[PDB]
Amino acid sequence: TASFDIEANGKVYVEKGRRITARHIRQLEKDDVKLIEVPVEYIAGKVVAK
Amino acid sequence: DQVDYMDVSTQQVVSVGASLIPFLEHDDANRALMGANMQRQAVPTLRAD
Amino acid sequence: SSLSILAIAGVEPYQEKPGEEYMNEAQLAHFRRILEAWRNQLRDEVDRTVTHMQDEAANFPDPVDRAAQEEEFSLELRNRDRERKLIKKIEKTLKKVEDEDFGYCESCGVEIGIRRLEARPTADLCIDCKTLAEIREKQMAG
Numbered sequence A: 001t002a003s004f005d006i007e008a009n010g011k012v013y014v015e016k017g018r019r020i021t022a023r024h025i026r027q028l029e030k031d032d033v034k035l036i037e038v039p040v041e042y043i044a045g046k047v048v049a050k
Numbered sequence B: 001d002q003v004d005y006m007d008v009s010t011q012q013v014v015s016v017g018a019s020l021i022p023f024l025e026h027d028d029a030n031r032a033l034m035g036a037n038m039q040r041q042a043v044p045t046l047r048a049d
Numbered sequence C: 001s002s003l004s005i006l007a008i009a010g011v012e013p014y015q016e017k018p019g020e021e022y023m024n025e026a027q028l029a030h031f032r033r034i035l036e037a038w039r040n041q042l043r044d045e046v047d048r049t050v051t052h053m054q055d056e057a058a059n060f061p062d063p064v065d066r067a068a069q070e071e072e073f074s075l076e077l078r079n080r081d082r083e084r085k086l087i088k089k090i091e092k093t094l095k096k097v098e099d100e101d102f103g104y105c106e107s108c109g110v111e112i113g114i115r116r117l118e119a120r121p122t123a124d125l126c127i128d129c130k131t132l133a134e135i136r137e138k139q140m141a142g
């Protein structure tokens, strides 16, 4: 589930709070989406790999 | 256009003892089982026919 | 064809009208009828089954035919157990319909297709959530 608006190139791909479906994945791949903005709080949850 | 192999012959599913019973195709499995088990216990008669 | 779940009742596939809202009185009545018919049939089938089991049961002198007569009963009882498990699911679906909270996915608020509900009227989730849950299930099970 998106914890923030998943957007790129001025386009919101997934509205905040929507579950990401196969259609969402197909749209992101079709649009050559390779970089998205994230908040620091989302990464703070994560475990560093090195 | 997908079958890689095929059974060599129909008889390969069953052993020799069970293979000797005729018309296995119409017999319940349990009675086939007992048929083979008891059939192997037959005693030779005076004149085999 | 007299073999589906719409066939059990004398109902024919619905037809959502152009500007028809999703869940209206008529659709709710339709699905309630479907579920009630399904249930009552299953219960009558259980009654048949039980009468059969009560009539047949006897003491056989041969150990290789007591197994014969108790190997079809095991399958029959299996089917009956499964349908008994499904009667609780039908009851719950009748509770969602009576409460007027029927037709939407339980995971995400998206509404479940009408044709899917006519396919499996007990559907609780949308196809996507259903598939993901099925994966999680098979993985926690196997």
Ligand SMILES: Nc1nc2c(ncn2[C@@H]2O[C@H](COP(=O)(O)OP(=O)(O)O)[C@@H](OP(=O)(O)OP(=O)(O)O)[C@H]2O)c(=O)[nH]1
Pocket (backbone or CB within 6 Å): C082, C083, C085, C086, C089
């Ligand atoms: N006759 C019949 N029974 C149904 C039907 N739909 C569901 N059931 C039974 O109801 C039980 C509950 O199913 P669920 O755990 O809710 O899984 P589900 O969401 O896919 O329906 C199942 O038992 P189960 O233990 O999961 O089945 P199984 O694992 O022994 O195969 C299933 O056998 C149906 O359409 N017809």
Ligand SMILES: [Zn+2]
Pocket (backbone or CB within 6 Å): C105, C106, C107, C108, C109, C110, C125, C126, C127, C128, C129, C130
């Ligand atoms: Zn869903």
